[PDB]
Amino acid sequence: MQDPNADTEWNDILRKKGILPPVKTYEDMTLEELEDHEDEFNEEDERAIEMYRRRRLAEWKATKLKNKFGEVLEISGKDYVQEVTKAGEGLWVILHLYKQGIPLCALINQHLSGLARKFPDVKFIKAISTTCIPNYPDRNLPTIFVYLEGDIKAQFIGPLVFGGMNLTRDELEWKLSESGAIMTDLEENP
Amino acid sequence: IQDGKGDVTITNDGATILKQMQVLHPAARMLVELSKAQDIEAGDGTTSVVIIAGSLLDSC
Amino acid sequence: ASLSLAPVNIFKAGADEERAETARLTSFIGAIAIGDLVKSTLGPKGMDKILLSSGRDASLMVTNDGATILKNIGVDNPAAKVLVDMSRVQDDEVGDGTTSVTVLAAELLREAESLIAKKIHPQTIIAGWREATKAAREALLSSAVDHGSDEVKFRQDLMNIAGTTLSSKLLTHHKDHFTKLAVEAVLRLKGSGNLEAIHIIKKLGGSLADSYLDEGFLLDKKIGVNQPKRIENAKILIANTGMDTDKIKIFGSRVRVDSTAKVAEIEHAEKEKMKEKVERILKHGINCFINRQLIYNYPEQLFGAAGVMAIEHADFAGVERLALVTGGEIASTFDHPELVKLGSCKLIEEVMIGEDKLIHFSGVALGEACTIVLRGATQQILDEAERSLHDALCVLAQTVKDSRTVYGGGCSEMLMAHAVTQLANRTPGKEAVAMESYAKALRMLPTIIADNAGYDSADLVAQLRAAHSEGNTTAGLDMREGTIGDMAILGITESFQVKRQVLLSAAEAAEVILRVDNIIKAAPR
Amino acid sequence: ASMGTLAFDEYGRPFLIIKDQDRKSRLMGLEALKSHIMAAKAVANTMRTSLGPNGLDKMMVDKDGDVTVTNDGATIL
Amino acid sequence: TETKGTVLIKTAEELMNFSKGEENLMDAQVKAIADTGANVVVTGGKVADMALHYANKYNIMLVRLNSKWDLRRLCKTVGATALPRLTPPVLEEMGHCDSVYLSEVGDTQVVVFKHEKEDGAISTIVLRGSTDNLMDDIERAVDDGVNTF
Amino acid sequence: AVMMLDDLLQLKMIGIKKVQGGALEDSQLVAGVAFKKTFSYAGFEMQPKKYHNPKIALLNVELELKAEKDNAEIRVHTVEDYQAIVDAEWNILYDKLEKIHHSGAKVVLSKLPIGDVATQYFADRDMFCAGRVPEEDLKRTMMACGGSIQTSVNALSADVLGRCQVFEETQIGGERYNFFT
Amino acid sequence: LVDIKDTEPLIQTAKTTLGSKVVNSCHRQMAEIAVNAVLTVADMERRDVDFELIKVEGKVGGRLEDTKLIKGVIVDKDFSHPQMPKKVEDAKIAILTCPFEPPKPKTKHKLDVTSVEDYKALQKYEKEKFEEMIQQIKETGANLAICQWGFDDEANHLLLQNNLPAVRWVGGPEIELIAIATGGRIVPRFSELTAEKLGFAGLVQEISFGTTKDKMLVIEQCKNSRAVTIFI
Amino acid sequence: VEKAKIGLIQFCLSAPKTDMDNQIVVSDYAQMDRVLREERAYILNLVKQIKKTGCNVLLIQKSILRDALSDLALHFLNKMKIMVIKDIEREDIEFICKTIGTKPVAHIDQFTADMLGSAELAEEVNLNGSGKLLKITGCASPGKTVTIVVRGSNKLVIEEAERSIHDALCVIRCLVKKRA
Ligand SMILES: Nc1ncnc2c1ncn2[C@@H]1O[C@H](COP(=O)(O)OP(=O)(O)O)[C@@H](O)[C@H]1O
Ligand SMILES: [Mg+2]
Ligand SMILES: [Mg+2]
C-alpha cells in the first residue's frame, strides 16, 4: 500500500472500506503397562478397565494365533510359487534373493534372522537367486522382495540401494516397514 | 571450488579443477576426459594438455 | 463419415485417430525425419553425432553408428519407432548396415510420398516394390562373389571388408592398424562365431594407435595375498566352485549341541572340509587356479602355502574365455582328476596398463579367445572405438560364416537399381512408376555417400549409372580423390549378408509403413 | 435432452430422486437410436478400409507408446 | 490345544500315519455321534471338510449357526444342551423336533426346526411382505402386541 | 431344464455358462454337466480327452507334494532318516494317487488343487484329472453323475464314484469345456 | 477334402485367409505351414484342434522367408554348461521336473548335526546324492536331460563329465510340449526314471542368431510328433 | 613394542560359530555353567596358541559377520602382553603383508612363527593432540613399499599437498619409463 501496514487507524478504515486486504488412559496402556499401576486406577474406572483388559487379552491371543512361523526359512525355486505367490491370504512375505558368496547378502540374512524372531507375524524367506530365477545377474544382489497376496509390494534391489555395508539391524527394519510389512516402531535413523 | 555440497577444494591441478566443476557442455566434458587421460598416462601436464586442446580448436 | 470428425466423438479423453492423408502425412514426415537424422553419418567422410542425454547423469556419447543413434533418441512418431526397431534388428542380425537400411527405408518412403501425390494407390506401389525387391535380390546374388576357397584371397577379402567397415568410423585415422587387429581377432576364433569370446578392455590414456590385440589373454582380476605373482609353464584349473563358507546344500541342516566344545569341533570339521576340498584341487597337479566365485581367506591361505596362484571372482564370461584361450575345463567337482582337463599357457604374470594391474596369460594353448586393449584420450573416444571394433568384428564373423562378398561404394545399389530400371521399363502400368521410384531410392544411397564427402553427387552418380548401364558392373565411388573407379582394385567390398539384409529390411519396413492409412493412438499413460 | 428428471417439485420443495441426478445424463427414444447408429457407422467406416487384399492396415499406439500395425479387426478394436 | 500344537515327526512312519490317524479319529467321533441316534447336528463354530465328509457318510444334517444367541434359542426350542466337546450326547442332552428341513421361502433359503405341537419354548412369526420397510413396521406392530400380552 | 430338477427346483442345480462367440441358436442344454477347464499343469495335454463309460471320482482333496500339516515340524538327526522322510512324503502322495487309480475312476475332479506330479501320474495311467473345480460345478457333477464328494481317498467304492456315458473336453468359442453327458 | 493327401483345397483356403495380410509376400509358404500345422496337431475325426500343441515363436532377425514349421519344439534356452556339445543326434531325452539338487521335504524339517561324524555323514550324503542322480540318469541310457527347475554346480559338472548334455529352467508348457513331441513321459524324480519313459528326438541343436549372444534349442526329427512349432 | 613379531590373523577370536545355523541347547544348570567354562577354555587356547609363537603385536582383520575380538580374548591378549590392533581392513592386507613380511593366517592351526613379520619397533605415537598413528619402524626383509605421512594446518592445504606429492611421484614414474 501507499503507507506501511501497521497498528494505525488509517489502515483500519481502509480495511473497513474494502482496500488493503487483511499416561493418558488405561485404553492405550498395554498388558505390561496395565500391571505397572493396577492400584492407581479407581474402581469405577476399573469396571470399564475390565472390559478393556479383556479386549487387549483377546487381541494378544489373536496375535499369538497369527505368529505361525517366526523364523527365517529357505525355499528352492521349484516350490517358490507355493511359498510366495500362494502364501497365506493377507500374509506379508519378505523374500531375500541372495548368494552365499556375497558378504552383504550374509549381513542381510543375519539381520533377517533377527527380524524373524522380532516379527513372528511376517513370513521371512531366503533363496538363491540363480535357483529362483533362470540366470539371475550376479551384480544384482541382495534383492529384497516384499509380497502380499502374491503381489509384489516392494523391491529393494541392488548392492547399493539396499543401504551399504554399514547397514545395522535398524535401517533395514525401516526399509522393510516402508511398504508396511513388518511395522516397526521407530523412524529412519541412519 | 565449492561443490553442490559444502565441500571446498583449493587446487592447482587441471584434472582436479575440471572434474570438480561440472561443465555442462559436451566439448568441455571431453576436455575433462582429456585431462583425466593425461593424469593417467603421465600424472602431470593435465593443465597443459587442456590448454593445448583449447588452443588447437581456437586455431581451427 | 469418420471416426474422429463425427458429430459424436468415440474415444476416451486423450485419444485420437489420424485418417488417410493425415496418417500418411505423420508417417512419411516421421520416417523421413529419422532418415535425415541418421544420414550425414554415411560413408567414409561421415561425421559423428553427440548423444547428450538429459538424464540425471547426462550421459555423453559421440557416435557414427546409426543403430546407437536411433536407440538413444526419444521418439514419439510410430513410423519413426518402426524404423528405429528396424535398425536395432539390423544391428542384431549383422553388425553393419543400420544407417544404410535406415536411409534406404526413409528414401523409399520419400519416393512413396511423391507417388501418393501422383494419385497412385499404395498397393500398386507395394506391388511394384515387391517386384523391384525380387529383381534387386537376383541382381545382388548374381553379382556376389565367393573366395572362401582360396585362403590368401579370403584373407585379402577379410582385410578389405574390415577396412571398409572401419572407414566410416573414427578408426579410419589408423584404419590399417585396426584392420589388422580385427582380422587377427576374428581368425583367432578358428571358425567359431562367438563374439563374446572377443573381450575388449578400454583403458583410458595413451593414443588410439597404442591399441593392440594381445597375443595371449588379459584378465582384470586379482591374485591372492600370499600367493605367487609369476608362473612359468602354468597348469591351470578353471573352476566354478564355492570356496566361500561352503555350506552343504541341505538347508534344514543345523548344528544343535549342548556344549560350546562341540560347536568348536564342528567348526573345525567345516575347516577340515574346506582343506580337503583344496587338497582334492591340488591333486590335479596345478600351479594356477581360477574360480568363478570368491575364494575366502582360508582357501586363499591354503593355495598360498601350496604355491598356487588363485585368481578369484572371474565371471561366467571370464571363465568361458579362459577355457577357450587355455584349453581347460570349467569344473566344480574334483574327485576324478583323470577326467578334468587342465589349461596351459607358457607364462602367467602381472602387467601394468595405465594405472591398473592385470593378469597376463602368454603362450596360451588354444587361443580361441581374444583380448584387445583399446587406449584413447577420452571415454567418448573409447566408447566409439569399441563400437566401431564391434561393427568390424561382427561383419568379419558374418563373412567367415558366409564368404560371399559384394562390392560397395554404391556399386551394389547402382546395380540393383539398374536391374529394377530394366524391369520397370519392361513392365506396364503404374507399377513401372513405383519400380522407377524404388530405383531412385537405391540411387539416392550412393548420392548421399558422395554428398557427405563434398563431391558432385549428381555428376558422380550419373557417371556410375551410365557405367552400370554400359556393363561395368564393378564401377563405384573412389572417395580418396572423388572419382569413379574399380572396386575390385581399390578393395571396396562388403558382406553379401550385410547388403542383402540392408535391402530386404529396408524394403520390408517401407512396405509395412506404406500399408497404414489410419493411426489410432490411445490415451497416454 | 439429458440430465434425467428436471422438475424440482411444483410446490418449490427439493425433488431429488436419483443420486447425482444433476451430474448424470440420459438419452431417450429415437435420438438414442440415432446416436447408436452414428457410433456404429463411425466404427464400421473406420474398419471397412482394412477389408480385402487391397485393404490397408492401421497403426495402433498403446498407453506406453508401443506400436502395433495390423489389419485384424479384432486386434484393432 | 489351547496353548500351542506342533506335530513333532521324527520317523517316516509317524509322517505316513499322521493324516490317516486324524481321519480315523474324525470317523470315530462322528460315528459315535451318529450311533447315539442323532440325525441332525448343529454347531456354533466352523465345520471341517473331513467332519463334513463323515457327517454326509453317516447321513447327518449339518447346520452352522454363526451367532451364539441363535444357538441358545435353538437349544431352548428343541430341548437340547450345547456341548463344548465333540462327545456324543447323553439321552438328556439331545433335542427333538417333529421335522427339520431346508425350504425356500421366496428367494430366501431357510432351515426350519418345526414342531407339530401347538406349544414349545420358542415360536417364530414368518413375516411376508413386498417391502423391507413395510416388514420392519409390521415387526414393530408385532412387538407392540407381544409387549401388550 | 425344470422338468429334470427333483422336488425343490433349485436354481443352483441349473448351470448357466456364457461362452462368448456364436449365435443364440448355437446355445444348448446339456442333460449332464459342463464346466470350463481349470488351470491345468504340465502333462494335461498328455492326458486323453474322451471316455466312453467313465467312472468319476469327485474329491475334496489336495493332490500334490505339500507340508503334511502347517503346524508340522520334522526333526531328524541322521541322513538316513532324512532320506526316509523325503521318500515318506513321496509315498504319502503316491499312495493317495494309487487309491484313486485302483477305484477304477478314469476321471478325477478335485475341489482343491491337483499338482503337476499328480497331473503327470494320472496322465501316465491314462486318466483325466481336473483340480480347483468350483464347488457348485462339483455339486452339479455329483447330482448328475451320481456319486459323493470325498475328502479322503481311503474308501473309494463304486458307491461313491460317479458315472456318465460320455466325458469329453471340447472347444466352445475360444474356451475349453469339460462335458459330462 | 480335408485329407492329408490332397492339401491343395486347404492351401487355397489358407491363401485366401492370408491374402489380406502383410505376410502374403511369402503367401504360399505361409499357407502351407499353417495347413501342415493343423494337420500335424489334430484328432481329424472331425474332432477338435488344440492350439496349445502349436507353439508360435518369433525372433527378430532373418527374413520372412525363414519362417518355417518345426515338427517338434523350440525353446528359448541353451545347454546348461558352456562346454557341452551344441548338437545331439539320435537323442534319448529324460524329461524331469526334479531340480538336480539334494532332496528337501516339503514339510518344515530340521536335520540336526550333533557331532563331527554327523557332519561328515551329511557331507558324504550330499556327494553321494549328486553322484547317484547322475548315475541314475546315465543308467537309463539317456543322451540328454531336460529339467524344469534348474540345478547347481556339482550337478552341472557331473553332467558334463559323464557326457550328458542338459537343459535347465525349461517351462512347464515347454516341458509338456517336449514330452508330447519326443514321445517321452515327464518324470518327477530320478528313482522313477527308466528307458521307456524317455523321449526320442532325431536332432537336438543349439542355434545362434548372428551378433546376439542369444541361443535357442531346437528339438526335431521326432517319429510322429503330435506337437509342432512355427518359427517366425 | 620393541623387537616386534607381528601376526596378521584373518580368523575371529570369539565364541565358536559354525558356518551353519548353530545353537547350544541347555536343559540342566550343569550345561549352563559348562557353556561359559568351555567358551573361556576355547578362547584361552586360541590366545595361547598365538602367544607361544613369540608374537607380541597382533593385527586382526575386520569381520562384520561375527565378533573378531571378544572382550574375553582382549583380556587374555592383554594379560599375555600382546599389542592388539583390530578393524584392519580387507583392502590393506596385501599392503601390510608386503610391508612387514607377515603372512595372513586364516586358521589357528597354521599360526606359526614362520608366518610372522619381524619389525624393530611398533609404537602408537601421538600427533600432539591431533590424533594418533600406529607406526611400525624397521622391518626385516623390507618390502618394496613406503608410506608418506602428510601433515598440515587445514584440510585444504593437506589435500593439495597430497595432490602435489602425487604429481611429483608421477613425474618420477614418467621418468622410470621413457627415460628421456
Ligand atoms: N574407400 C571407399 N570408397 C567408397 N566407398 C566406401 C569406402 N569405404 C567405405 N565406403 C562405403 O561407405 C559406407 C559406410 O557405411 P556405414 O556408415 O558403415 O553404413 P551403416 O552404418 O549403414 O553400416 C559403406 O556402405 C561403403 O559402401
Ligand atoms: Mg560400417
Ligand atoms: Mg481374413
Side-chain angles (χ1 to χ4, degrees), chain C residues 211-281:
Chain C
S211 285
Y212 62 97
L213 161 71
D214 201 355
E215 48 96 9
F217 189 78
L218 274 152
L219 196 76
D220 49 330
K221 272 57 178 48
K222 286 186 168 297
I223 294 158
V225 180
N226 187 36
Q227 292 164 202
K229 294 287 179 53
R230 190 169 195 278
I231 295 193
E232 302 104 290
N233 317 124
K235 298 154 221 310
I236 301 145
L237 187 56
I238 311 164
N240 189 1
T241 58
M243 312 219 76
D244 56 347
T245 193
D246 195 340
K247 291 171 65 168
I248 298 132
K249 277 109 180 195
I250 311 309
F251 303 132
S253 62
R254 65 179 181 174
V255 174
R256 173 151 292 218
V257 290
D258 54 316
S259 93
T260 83
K262 299 195 185 75
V263 185
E265 293 158 14
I266 298 292
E267 190 198 329
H268 197 92
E270 298 182 331
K271 292 272 175 284
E272 208 79 10
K273 175 188 142 88
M274 178 40 77
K275 180 170 54 171
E276 298 159 9
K277 191 46 51 186
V278 171
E279 296 162 351
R280 290 181 250 294
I281 277 159

Side-chain angles (χ1 to χ4, degrees), chain C residues 208-401:
Chain C
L208 207 49
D210 298 331
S211 285
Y212 62 97
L213 161 71
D214 201 355
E215 48 96 9
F217 189 78
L218 274 152
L219 196 76
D220 49 330
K221 272 57 178 48
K222 286 186 168 297
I223 294 158
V225 180
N226 187 36
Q227 292 164 202
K229 294 287 179 53
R230 190 169 195 278
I231 295 193
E232 302 104 290
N233 317 124
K235 298 154 221 310
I236 301 145
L237 187 56
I238 311 164
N240 189 1
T241 58
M243 312 219 76
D244 56 347
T245 193
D246 195 340
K247 291 171 65 168
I248 298 132
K249 277 109 180 195
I250 311 309
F251 303 132
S253 62
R254 65 179 181 174
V255 174
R256 173 151 292 218
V257 290
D258 54 316
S259 93
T260 83
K262 299 195 185 75
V263 185
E265 293 158 14
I266 298 292
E267 190 198 329
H268 197 92
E270 298 182 331
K271 292 272 175 284
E272 208 79 10
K273 175 188 142 88
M274 178 40 77
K275 180 170 54 171
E276 298 159 9
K277 191 46 51 186
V278 171
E279 296 162 351
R280 290 181 250 294
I281 277 159
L282 302 172
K283 299 220 181 78
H284 285 69
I286 67 182
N287 289 336
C288 190
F289 174 76
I290 297 133
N291 197 24
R292 186 202 84 67
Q293 317 182 214
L294 298 206
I295 304 184
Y296 275 28
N297 299 140
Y298 185 38
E300 187 182 18
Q301 162 186 254
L302 299 170
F303 283 120
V308 175
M309 196 144 69
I311 300 148
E312 77 149 15
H313 205 217
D315 289 345
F316 286 99
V319 296
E320 285 166 44
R321 294 177 186 126
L322 282 161
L324 287 164
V325 64
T326 50
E329 186 185 71
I330 304 142
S332 316
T333 54
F334 316 101
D335 301 84
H336 313 86
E338 57 276 358
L339 297 172
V340 179
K341 189 174 182 299
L342 302 177
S344 166
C345 52
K346 299 302 199 313
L347 170 60
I348 306 182
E349 54 179 1
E350 263 197 339
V351 304
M352 291 297 293
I353 302 194
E355 289 193 53
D356 302 292
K357 249 174 169 60
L358 313 166
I359 317 311
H360 185 26
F361 305 75
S362 89
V364 294
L366 305 177
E368 303 165 3
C370 316
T371 302
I372 306 170
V373 185
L374 287 183
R375 315 243 49 197
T378 65
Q379 258 303 310
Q380 299 53 248
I381 280 162
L382 289 168
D383 302 356
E384 190 43 41
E386 180 181 299
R387 288 189 279 263
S388 309
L389 256 188
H390 176 259
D391 277 3
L393 298 164
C394 293
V395 176
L396 299 157
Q398 272 280 4
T399 48
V400 172
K401 276 186 274 286

Side-chain angles (χ1 to χ4, degrees), chain G residues 13-33:
Chain G
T13 319
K15 271 170 89 161
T16 299
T17 309
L18 302 169
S20 53
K21 304 290 178 273
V22 67
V23 316
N24 53 30
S25 42
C26 308
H27 212 188
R28 194 191 169 78
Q29 176 195 141
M30 297 293 103
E32 291 172 333
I33 64 184

Side-chain angles (χ1 to χ4, degrees), chain C residues 55-210:
Chain C
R56 263 210 171 151
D57 313 308
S59 69
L60 170 67
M61 308 162 39
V62 295
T63 57
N64 181 100
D65 207 60
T68 65
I69 291 160
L70 302 167
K71 287 195 301 267
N72 295 280
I73 50 176
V75 175
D76 272 308
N77 190 298
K81 290 171 164 152
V82 175
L83 293 200
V84 168
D85 185 72
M86 179 190 61
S87 65
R88 168 185 72 74
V89 176
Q90 263 278 138
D91 194 354
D92 292 351
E93 252 289 321
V94 288
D96 204 64
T98 69
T99 312
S100 298
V101 75
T102 312
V103 169
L104 239 188
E107 294 298 337
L108 288 169
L109 292 170
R110 172 177 271 122
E111 304 285 356
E113 193 186 0
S114 307
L115 295 170
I116 292 268
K118 289 186 181 184
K119 302 290 185 181
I120 290 165
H121 199 102
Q123 271 319 323
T124 296
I125 305 184
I126 286 167
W129 279 8
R130 298 221 189 124
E131 286 291 321
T133 317
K134 295 176 203 317
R137 279 184 84 170
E138 291 115 12
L140 205 67
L141 190 63
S142 309
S143 71
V145 63
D146 196 333
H147 295 302
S149 300
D150 186 356
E151 195 283 328
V152 63
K153 186 149 41 183
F154 191 59
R155 162 88 58 153
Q156 201 45 72
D157 274 12
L158 290 169
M159 280 282 274
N160 289 339
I161 287 166
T164 311
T165 49
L166 305 170
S167 66
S168 168
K169 308 314 182 86
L170 184 75
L171 312 188
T172 181
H173 306 339
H174 324 277
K175 217 176 75 209
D176 62 309
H177 183 55
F178 288 95
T179 322
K180 296 160 192 182
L181 293 201
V183 169
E184 299 167 351
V186 162
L187 295 180
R188 271 178 61 164
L189 308 182
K190 282 78 172 181
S192 159
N194 185 13
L195 303 177
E196 174 281 331
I198 302 174
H199 189 205
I200 281 168
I201 309 172
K202 291 183 290 196
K203 297 308 299 175
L204 189 61
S207 43
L208 207 49
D210 298 331

Side-chain angles (χ1 to χ4, degrees), chain A residues 64-94:
Chain A
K64 296 164 77 75
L65 170 147
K66 228 50 186 170
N67 310 296
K68 316 313 203 285
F69 0 84
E71 201 51 28
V72 172
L73 63 100
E74 161 131 8
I75 62 171
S76 203
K78 153 183 49 58
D79 60 323
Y80 164 93
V81 52
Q82 270 66 241
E83 282 288 17
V84 197
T85 319
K86 287 194 34 171
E89 283 266 20
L91 172 86
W92 294 87
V93 176
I94 176 178

Side-chain angles (χ1 to χ4, degrees), chain A residues 162-176:
Chain A
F162 90 112
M165 251 297 180
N166 59 26
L167 188 146
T168 172
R169 223 199 68 181
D170 181 27
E171 39 180 322
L172 183 60
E173 169 170 284
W174 179 253
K175 288 205 198 80
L176 308 180

Side-chain angles (χ1 to χ4, degrees), chain C residues 222-226 229 245-248 250 253-264 266-268 270-272 275 297-302 350 354-355, chain H residues 10 15-26 31 34-36 38-39 42 61 66 90 93-94 97-98 103-107 109-110 115 166 170 173 177:
Chain C
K222 286 186 168 297
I223 294 158
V225 180
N226 187 36
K229 294 287 179 53
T245 193
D246 195 340
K247 291 171 65 168
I248 298 132
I250 311 309
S253 62
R254 65 179 181 174
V255 174
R256 173 151 292 218
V257 290
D258 54 316
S259 93
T260 83
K262 299 195 185 75
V263 185
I266 298 292
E267 190 198 329
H268 197 92
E270 298 182 331
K271 292 272 175 284
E272 208 79 10
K275 180 170 54 171
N297 299 140
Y298 185 38
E300 187 182 18
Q301 162 186 254
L302 299 170
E350 263 197 339
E355 289 193 53
Chain H
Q10 300 166 307
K17 181 179 178 180
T18 57
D19 294 301
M20 314 157 60
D21 187 350
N22 61 279
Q23 273 290 344
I24 292 164
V25 172
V26 169
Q31 294 176 357
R34 191 198 315 152
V35 158
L36 315 165
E38 289 184 343
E39 192 209 281
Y42 174 74
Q61 209 192 44
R66 63 145 150 176
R90 303 167 160 259
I93 299 297
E94 198 165 301
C97 288
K98 210 204 289 273
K103 307 214 188 188
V105 193
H107 189 216
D109 283 12
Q110 297 78 344
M115 303 281 273
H166 188 253
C170 297
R173 176 187 73 200
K177 46 170 178 167

